[PDB]
Structure formats: C-alpha cells, structure tokens
Amino acid sequence: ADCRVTCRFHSTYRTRSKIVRYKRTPGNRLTSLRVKKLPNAPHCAETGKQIHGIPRVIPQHLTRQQRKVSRPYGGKLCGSALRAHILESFLNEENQALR
Amino acid sequence: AKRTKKVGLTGKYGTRYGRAARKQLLKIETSQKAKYTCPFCAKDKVRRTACGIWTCRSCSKTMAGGAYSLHTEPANAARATIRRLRLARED
Amino acid sequence: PNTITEENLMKMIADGRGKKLVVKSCKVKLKLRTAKYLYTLTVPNADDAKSIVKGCKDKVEVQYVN
Amino acid sequence: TANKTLSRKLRLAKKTKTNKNIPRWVIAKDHLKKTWNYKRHHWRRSHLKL
Amino acid sequence: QGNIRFAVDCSAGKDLELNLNEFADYVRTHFKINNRKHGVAEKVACSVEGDSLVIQTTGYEFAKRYVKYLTKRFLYQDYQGVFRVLSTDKETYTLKPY
RNA sequence: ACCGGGAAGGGGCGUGCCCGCCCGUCGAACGGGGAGCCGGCGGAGACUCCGGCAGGCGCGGGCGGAGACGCGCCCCCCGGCGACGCGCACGGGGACCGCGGCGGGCGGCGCCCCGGCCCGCGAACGCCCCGCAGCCCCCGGACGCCUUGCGCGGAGAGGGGGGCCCGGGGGCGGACCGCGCGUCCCCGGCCGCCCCUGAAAAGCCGGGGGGCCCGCGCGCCGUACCGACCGCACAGGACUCCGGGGUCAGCAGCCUCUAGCGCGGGAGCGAACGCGGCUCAGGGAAGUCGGCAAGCCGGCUCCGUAACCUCGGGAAAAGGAGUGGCUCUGACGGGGUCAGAACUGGAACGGACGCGGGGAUCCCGACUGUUUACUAGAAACACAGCGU
Numbered sequence: 001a002d003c004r005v006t007c008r009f010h011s012t013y014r015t016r017s018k019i020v021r022y023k024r025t026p027g028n029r030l031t032s033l034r035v036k037k038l039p040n041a042p043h044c045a046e047t048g049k050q051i052h053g054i055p056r057v058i059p060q061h062l063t064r065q066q067r068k069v070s071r072p073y074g075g076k077l078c079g080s081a082l083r084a085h086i087l088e089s090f091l092n093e094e095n096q097a098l099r
Numbered sequence: 100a101k102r103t104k105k106v107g108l109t110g111k112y113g114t115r116y117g118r119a120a121r122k123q124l125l126k127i128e129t130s131q132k133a134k135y136t137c138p139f140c141a142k143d144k145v146r147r148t149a150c151g152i153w154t155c156r157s158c159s160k161t162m163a164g165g166a167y168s169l170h171t172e173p174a175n176a177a178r179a180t181i182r183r184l185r186l187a188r189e190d
Numbered sequence: 191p192n193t194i195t196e197e198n199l200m201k202m203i204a205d206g207r208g209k210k211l212v213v214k215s216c217k218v219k220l221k222l223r224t225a226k227y228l229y230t231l232t233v234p235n236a237d238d239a240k241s242i243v244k245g246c247k248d249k250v251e252v253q254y255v256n
Numbered sequence: 257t258a259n260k261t262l263s264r265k266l267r268l269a270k271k272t273k274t275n276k277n278i279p280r281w282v283i284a285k286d287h288l289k290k291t292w293n294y295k296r297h298h299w300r301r302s303h304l305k306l
Numbered sequence: 307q308g309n310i311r312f313a314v315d316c317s318a319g320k321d322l323e324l325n326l327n328e329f330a331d332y333v334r335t336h337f338k339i340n341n342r343k344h345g346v347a348e349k350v351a352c353s354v355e356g357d358s359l360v361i362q363t364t365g366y367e368f369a370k371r372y373v374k375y376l377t378k379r380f381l382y383q384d385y386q387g388v389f390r391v392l393s394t395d396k397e398t399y400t401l402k403p404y
Numbered sequence: 405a406c407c408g409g410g411a412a413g414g415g416g417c418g419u420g421c422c423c424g425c426c427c428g429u430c431g432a433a434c435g436g437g438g439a440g441c442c443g444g445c446g447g448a449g450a451c452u453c454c455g456g457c458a459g460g461c462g463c464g465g466g467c468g469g470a471g472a473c474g475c476g477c478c479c480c481c482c483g484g485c486g487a488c489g490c491g492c493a494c495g496g497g498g499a500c501c502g503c504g505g506c507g508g509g510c511g512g513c514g515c516c517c518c519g520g521c522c523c524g525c526g527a528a529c530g531c532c533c534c535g536c537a538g539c540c541c542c543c544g545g546a547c548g549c550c551u552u553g554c555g556c557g558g559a560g561a562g563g564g565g566g567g568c569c570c571g572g573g574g575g576c577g578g579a580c581c582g583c584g585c586g587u588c589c590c591c592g593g594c595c596g597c598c599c600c601u602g603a604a605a606a607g608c609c610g611g612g613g614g615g616c617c618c619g620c621g622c623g624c625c626g627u628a629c630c631g632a633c634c635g636c637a638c639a640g641g642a643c644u645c646c647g648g649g650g651u652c653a654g655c656a657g658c659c660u661c662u663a664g665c666g667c668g669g670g671a672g673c674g675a676a677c678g679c680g681g682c683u684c685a686g687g688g689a690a691g692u693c694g695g696c697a698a699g700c701c702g703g704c705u706c707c708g709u710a711a712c713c714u715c716g717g718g719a720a721a722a723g724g725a726g727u728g729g730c731u732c733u734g735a736c737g738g739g740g741u742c743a744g745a746a747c748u749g750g751a752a753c754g755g756a757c758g759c760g761g762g763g764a765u766c767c768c769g770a771c772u773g774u775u776u777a778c779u780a781g782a783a784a785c786a787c788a789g790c791g792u
C-alpha cells in the first residue's frame with residue numbers, strides 16, 4: 001500500500017532526541033513512537049567502570065532501595081577499589097608506626 | 100605473499116609527495132604504530148593515544164612520553180644523570 | 191491494567207476499594223474498577239458463581255454478554 | 257508564522273478588523289460622494305511591516 | 307490428510323431450469339487433482355441430494371474456493387449474469403439472483 | 405559617551421547565634437529538559453475536544469547471602485548522571501517487502517485458468533518469564549580458549565556453578581497460519597584514524613563524617629491555512645521529514661500501484677525560412693585560424709598488455725573473443741550464485757535504456773584545492789618542503 005507518515009515533533013530537524021520507531025495500531029494504521037535516549041548508569045570513581053546493580057534509569061524514577069548497594073561505599077567504589085583502600089589504610093598504620 | 104617491495108606502509112600515498120618525504124614517514128609511522136612494553140605490566144601492550152600520551156591496554160596505566168615513540172633518547176640520558184645526582188647527594 | 195489472583199480480589203472488595211464490577215461471558219472475565227488500576231480475573235462459570243454470591247452488597251455489579 | 261508572539265498577533269488583529277467599507281447608512285447620514293475607504297489593503301499586494 | 311465435505315445449494319435453481327445431474331456431470335469430469343484426472347472417482351464423489359450438489363471425499367482435502375470455481379465455469383454456458391455465488395455457512399454455498 | 409574586579413558586595417533561621425570573596429529570572433520555538441497512548445465525533449480544530457486506559461509533580465485526611473549482590477532528613481566534603489568525533493565491515497531487533505497455505509469478496513472469459521486482483525487488524529502502560537556480546541564472584545591451578553578481522557590468560561586460562569547491565573522479545577492483562585532474500589532505521593562488541601582528540605549549565609541522585617490507603621489540584625502564551633514567500637506580477641531563488649513494485653551493481657535510465665491532477669485560449673493549412681531532431685551513394689579533413697560541431701568507443705566474462713618510472717604506478721595501456729531462447733547437468737548448507745553441454749532462430753542477442761574513442765610527442769604548472777557574482781578557470785593565487 002502506501003505506508004508513509006508525517007513528522008510527530010514541533011519541527012522536523014532530526015537531532016538525537018527526535019528519533020521515532022514505527023508500529024501498527026489496532027485500527028490498522030502506522031503510528032510513530034518516540035525512542036528515548038537511555039542514560040548511562042553510574043561509574044566507579046577510581047576505575048570508571050559501570051557500578052553493578054543499578055538499572056539505566058534516571059534516579060528520580062527509582063525507589064530509594066533500587067538506587068543503592070549494600071556495602072561501605074556502595075555506589076561509589078566498584079568493590080575491588082574498596083578492598084585496595086582497606087589494605088592501604090591498615091598496612092600504612094603498620095609501617096608508619098612500629099617501624 | 101609479499102605485496103610491495105619497498106614502500107611498505109607508505110603505499111597508501113600512491114605516487115604523490117616525492118621520495119624524500121615518503122622515506123621519512125616510513126620510519127616515523129612505523130614507530131608510532133608500534134607496541135611498547137609496560138614499565139609496570141612488563142607486557143608488550145603500550146599504544147599511543149595522542150601525541151605524547153601512551154596507555155597500557157593491560158595495566159590501564161597512562162604515561163607521558165615522546166611524540167612518536169614511548170621513550171626519547173634525550174629523556175633517557177636526563178633520567179640517568181638525574182639519578183646519579185641524587186645518589187651523590189646521599190653522604 | 192493488571193491481572194489478579196482470586197483471593198486478592200475479595201480483599202480489595204472487602205476494603206471497599208472497588209467502584210464497579212463487570213461479568214463478561216466468552217471462561218468468564220471479571221473486571222473491577224479501582225482508583226488506580228482496572229483488574230481482570232478469568233474463571234470458568236462454575237467458579238464465578240460462588241465469587242459473585244460473596245460479592246459485596248456495597249459493590250455495584252453489572253453483566254454483559256452478546 | 258504559526259509561532260508568533262502575542263504582541264505581534266494583536267497588531268495584526270487590528271489591521272484585519274479595520275479593513276472595511278463605509279457603511280451605507282453613514283453614506284446617507286454624512287452626505288458623501290466618495291464612498292471608497294482608501295485605507296483598505298489586500299493581502300496579495302500589501303507589505304504590512306508588523 | 308482425511309475426509310471433508312462440501313455442498314452447493316441451488317434452491318433458486320427451480321424457476322429457470324437447471325438439471326442437477328448435468329451440474330453433477332460437469333463436476334464429475336472436470337475435477338483435477340495434481341493437474342490430472344486419473345484417480346478422482348476413488349477420492350471425490352459427486353452426489354445429488356437436496357437438489358444440491360454434494361462433494362464427499364475420502365482421504366482427500368482441498369479448498370472451498372475450488373468448489374466455487376467449478377460452479378462459475380459450469381454456470382458460464384447459458385447463465386452469464388444470472389447467479390452470484392455466496393457463502394451461507396461452513397461447507398455450503400448458495401446461489402443468489404441479482 | 406566609552407572602558408573596568410580589588411569595593412565594608414548575603415544568607416539560614418527562631419530570638420539570637422551561626423555560615424559566607426566578587427553579577428545577570430540577557431543570549432537556542434534544531435542543543436539540555438519530570439511525564440501520553442488507542443478509538444471516535446465536525447463545514448472549517450485536535451498528541452489540545454468526547455469516551456476509555458495510563459503517567460508526572462504537588463497539596464490535604466534492619467534483614468538474607470560464602471561472595472559478586474539481593475530485599476526520613478539536615479549541613480560540610482568527595483563523586484555520579486545530565487554528557488557527546490569520524491570510519492569500512494560484522495552481529496541483533498523493529499518496520500517495510502515478497503512466496504505458499506487457508507477464509508471472505510471481485511473481474512474478464514474466442515481457447516487456457518485451483519496461474520489475475522482486493523481484504524484478513526492489535527498501541528501506550530502494569531506484572532511474570534527469557535535475553536548474544538560485555539563486566540564481576542566461587543572452586544582450582546594451566547601447551548589452551550577464540551573472532552569475518554582480532555583478541556585473552558600465574559596481575560589466574562579452560563571446565564563446572566553463579567551475579568549485574570542490556571532503547572529487545574515472549575505469556576497474561578489492556579482487548580488467521582508458516583517460510584524467506586533484501587532494503588531502511590536504531591542499537592552492540594570490537595578494530596582503525598589524528599602536530600584534528602570531538603560544549604556547557606539548570607536540575608536530579610549516591611557516598612563518607614557529624615546533627616537529628618483515600619481525596620483535591622496543575623496558572624500564563626502559540627495552535628486556522630499556504631511554498632498564498634522574495635524577485636514592481638514571473639521557466640529564477642527558497643532549510644528539513646516520510647519514501648512501494650518490475651528490469652538492474654543501483655536512491656542511475658526506462659515503465660508502473662497508492663495519492664494528485666495546470667501550464668496568458670482554440671481551430672485550419674502542411675510555402676520559404678528558422679529552432680530542436682533523423683537518414684544519406686562514392687570519397688574520407690581536400691573544409692576551417694583551428695576536427696568547431698557531429699560521429700566512432702562504451703555493460704559483463706575470459707585472453708592479452710610496451711616505453712618510461714619517485715618501484716607506488718603507467719593500465720580500461722594498446723589490442724582480441726564470447727553474450728538471445730529453449731531442454732538439461734554439476735558444485736556450495738532452504739537459497740541465489742558460479743560452471744558446463746545438446747537443440748534452435750535472415751549469419752541474431754549489453755537487440756530499448758544506460759554507457760571511455762585510441763596512440764606518438766613538445767611547452768607550462770609537481771600533485772588534490774582557490775579565483776575576476778554579470779565577457780578572463782589560467783601558465784595566475786594557495787600548498788607541503790626549503791631558507792633568511
């Protein structure tokens with residue numbers, strides 16, 4: 001048939017936040033549906049890798065329990081960075097004092 | 100089977116720019132595409148990322164170096180002379 | 191909209207959280223209109239009998255078939 | 257334009273409203289022979305700068 | 307494959323004259339299976355019951371659309387424009403005037 | 405009028421204390437941004453109305469795990485999201501597009517026809533399950549694992565069992581059935597490139613340390629229509645979005661489904677002469693300042709290719725041969741391609757369309773690039789390099 005559609009947004013300039021997909025409606029029609037940009041999840045302050053356990057949703061829409069991890073420095077350090085801070089702290093105390 | 104006889108990586112340039120320039124680039128461009136040794140990794144995985152900036156793809160350490168090679172010969176001598184001056188400061 | 195297990199259905203009724211119920215014959219569909227969601231339960235006609243008798247007298251029921 | 261300020265809309269709205277003929281009873285009342293209002297305008301040949 | 311049945315009703319085929327054996331005879335000789343006509347009497351049998359043709363088979367199945375094709379072929383001889391073939395139910399066609 | 409930090413520059417509260425270095429509620433109807441989908445109704449409006457189903461922001465009535473990880477606030481400091489380049493390829497999803505079945509409806513019908521045409525529809529949102537790559541945990545201690553390409557491992561591989569992310573898919577809600585080659589759009593993991601390394605802020609959140617269900621509402625402005633715009637009215641000029649079928653390497657040319665249908669008006673005649681086209685015996689640049697104009701060549705496959713050279717080129721050098729239709733065969737793991745053979749037709753086949761003429765030399769400028777908008781595109785300017 002003819003499946004061509006018109007633009008859905010205020011202007012037609014196809015920037016990165018004005019992308020649509022196509023879908024067939026229950027009245028036998030081809031509709032346009034915006035495709036949102038997906039934000040990154042938080043990244044480790046020491047290593048720059050994705051923090052595990054947090055979904056790629058803006059934190060305004062996630063419950064408080066969903067935004068956290070259950071460890072000291074839960075969403076700041078990646079687990080390996082914590083263990084390295086713990087060892088540095090304990091061992092320097094053992095060398096700046098008692099030889 | 101070998102594909103060129105002399106030009107090597109400068110075959111990408113065709114017949115342009117003359118022989119003296121292409122001779123210089125073969126040496127320079129071979130050097131900046133090379134793999135160098137992590138001074139820490141001890142593995143051969145250092146690659147240039149910008150002029151002066153070298154990263155181990157295994158350590159993930161980042162280092163400051165030459166424009167087209169990891170170590171320059173002036174900096175090797177400087178490090179060698181600076182080290183001997185410090186140890187001499189020790190009584 | 192969402193589906194529901196039968197036991198949760200009466201409790202919403204038992205706490206006056208429903209506004210209207212509809213019985214639909216096709217397996218029978220029971221649709222309850224709460225403040226937040228419309229809930230739908232599917233049962234055979236044998237099962238829907240007892241549930242409707244339990245039906246809260248404060249909860250308007252309607253029927254539908256065609 | 258479909259995207260105009262309310263201030264430009266109001267000045268355009270006044271040129272539309274006053275773009276009219278002399279009423280015929282006014283022509284009888286004031287005893288006129290010039291009957292055309294020469295302050296009228298037409299969209300194809302106008303340059304409203306508003 | 308199994309056995310299915312179809313039928314075409316010619317109830318409006320009384321005031322104008324239409325033999326039921328001829329229409330049965332037409333279908334009997336023209337039915338093709340795999341673009342051939344050897345091995346049809348042993349799969350597809352035309353009956354005449356209720357003034358309507360009946361096609362009972364045994365082990366052969368096919369589309370109801372072909373039973374409509376043989377109807378407009380046989381009707382094309384001296385009924386060009388008299389009948390429109392319409393669906394009344396499952397397996398049954400009905401002949402209707404204009 | 406123009407120019408500007410060196411100025412005793414304001415806040416939280418609750419008195420009274422405490423904290424504090426110093427502008428902008430200027431600048432984007434394409435950048436950033438809390439949240440919308442389906443059906444219906446009108447002469448002219450709809451993501452705005454009506455019906456239905458949702459979403460956002462407000463206001464009032466300490467536990468489980470071995471582990472990766474799972475399941476109220478306030479101030480000071482440390483962080484995160486917002487937040488980002490280009491590229492040949494490879495992979496996944498959606499939409500589109502085809503072939504076959506089956507269900508309903510059409511058309512024409514001299515012969516043939518189960519062979520032609522049209523219609524077979526399912527959103528946002530909520531709950532459960534499933535998700536390659538990629539990063540992480542546990543055991544344990546290595547001549548392997550693996551990509552089209554790579555890549556990885558005693559700084560702990562493979563194997564066995566797990567965790568997290570994944571713009572997606574399924575099932576139930578909201579409420580006809582299979583199989584394929586491609587095309588476009590977005591996404592993924594890699595790899596390549598740079599004397600080029602590819603915005604900012606509001607707003608929202610986490611960490612460390614210290615002190616401590618039911619109701620109601622959402623104001624202001626734009627919203628019709630148009631290439632109806634600028635060129636004194638007009639073959640000029642004027643940004644972006646969506647993009648079916650056949651032939652085909654194809655967004656080329658040529659024909660077409662859907663949709664749409666103006667372009668200062670008609671008729672007769674068939675002179676010269678013009679303007680845009682076609683064909684010409686024999687000769688083949690003798691024409692002309694000058695091959696100006698026109699013509700020859702051209703797709704694909706195989707054969708065959710010199711001087712010279714900065715060794716990269718020259719090169720489609722130059723030159724040759726084959727090519728339709730039909731009936732078949734072989735190869736690759738359902739799909740097109742590639743290879744071969746018989747038969748046949750005015751001695752034909754890239755049958756329209758599309759589509760280099762070639763070679764031997766001399767002068768100038770190395771090269772791609774730039775210019776006298778409206779008589780000059782060049783040998784002029786620029787350029788890397790070299791030098792002062």
Ligand SMILES: [K+]
Nearest residue numbers: 257258259628
């Ligand atoms: K408007």
Ligand SMILES: [K+]
Nearest residue numbers: 299300302303
């Ligand atoms: K005007």
Ligand SMILES: [K+]
Nearest residue numbers: 405406407408
């Ligand atoms: K001054």
Ligand SMILES: [K+]
Nearest residue numbers: 430431432435
């Ligand atoms: K601005």
Ligand SMILES: [K+]
Nearest residue numbers: 013432434435
């Ligand atoms: K802008």
Ligand SMILES: [K+]
Nearest residue numbers: 432433435436
């Ligand atoms: K804006």
Ligand SMILES: [K+]
Nearest residue numbers: 435436487488
């Ligand atoms: K940005």
Ligand SMILES: [K+]
Nearest residue numbers: 076482611612
């Ligand atoms: K912290």
Ligand SMILES: [K+]
Nearest residue numbers: 449450627628
């Ligand atoms: K409107």
Ligand SMILES: [K+]
Nearest residue numbers: 672673674675
């Ligand atoms: K004449």
Ligand SMILES: [K+]
Nearest residue numbers: 675676677678
């Ligand atoms: K003349």
Ligand SMILES: [K+]
Nearest residue numbers: 689691692695
């Ligand atoms: K000549």
Ligand SMILES: [K+]
Nearest residue numbers: 695696697698
């Ligand atoms: K010419």
Ligand SMILES: [K+]
Nearest residue numbers: 727728729730
């Ligand atoms: K052939």
Ligand SMILES: [K+]
Nearest residue numbers: 769782783784
């Ligand atoms: K020049």
Ligand SMILES: [K+]
Nearest residue numbers: 115771772773
């Ligand atoms: K060029």
